[PDB]
Amino acid sequence: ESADLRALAKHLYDSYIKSFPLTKAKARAILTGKTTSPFVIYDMNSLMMGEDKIKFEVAIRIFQGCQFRSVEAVQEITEYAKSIPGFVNLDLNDQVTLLKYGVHEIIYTMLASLMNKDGVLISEGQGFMTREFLKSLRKPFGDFMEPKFEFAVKFNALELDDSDLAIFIAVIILSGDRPGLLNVKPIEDIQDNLLQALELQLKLNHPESSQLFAKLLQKMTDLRQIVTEHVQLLQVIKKTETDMSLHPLLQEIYKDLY
Amino acid sequence: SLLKKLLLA
Ligand SMILES: CN(CCOc1ccc(C[C@H](Nc2ccccc2C(=O)c2ccccc2)C(=O)O)cc1)c1ccccn1
């Protein structure tokens, strides 16, 4: 059982590397300056000038940029989801439900890997947008990113690694608590095995953090609250600025979500 | 469904 759970941990990490181009290992090296620098975006001038580096009013340009990144993040997570053993053999309707509720919780989890207390890396590390600039936007645009920074500062203090995060994000989407699940028992059988590999991984990689498993599970509900606040803030955009419209992929995610 | 197309790819 022990050698099988460690093979599942090694299986998820290799699939993790192949699914996400900007890993946490690379991101922290860019933030600390311990490598061989991203264009800093701190105002409208640096944004209107750094638009040639962004993979894609001032607030609307940040809105459109996030939507473009979000569409790409969903596709990378979906690719990782298809590599979780047993996930692809589940019924296709439950695969959609599992990804419909788990994508944003994983996006915010991996959004912490690229964050420090000052800002967030954008465009696979080529840019750096500051928290002070994201908080000074016109409302309600200025209150979208601050809850993510507050969570990332607390979440990064756990000092998880890419091998730890690979199992943890797998635990997130394999949650049998999602509404609309047709066959719950096989999904919980996969998660319970994913939790065992996660528990074993945190004991091997972090022999100092005694209750890291317990602390990690407690942040797993903070992600559901961020999603709720993000949804209720997106509905204000739909009502206030009647000019904005969500991407068809993001529209299907939030369509009848919770 | 756009999600189904990404799962069936
Ligand atoms: C901040 N940053 C890193 C990526 O941050 C993300 C922060 C959040 C998300 C999730 C994603 N968000 C949006 C989707 C569509 C439109 C706007 C948003 C915003 O979240 C938003 C709203 C108002 C103001 C600013 C953002 C989702 O809900 O699917 C995805 C990515 C940027 C910013 C600009 C361009 C690229 N990188």
Numbering used by the authors:
A (entry chain A): 235 to 270, 273 to 292, 304 to 505
B (entry chain C): 142 to 150
Reported in the publication:
PPARγ (peroxisome proliferator-activated receptor gamma) is a transcription factor of the nuclear receptor family that functions predominantly as a heterodimer with RXRα. PPARγ is a key regulator of glucose homeostasis and adipogenesis. The recruitment of coactivators by PPARγ is primarily determined by the interaction of coactivator LXXLL motifs with the receptor LBD. Helix 12 is key regulatory structural element in the activation function 2 interacting with coregulators.
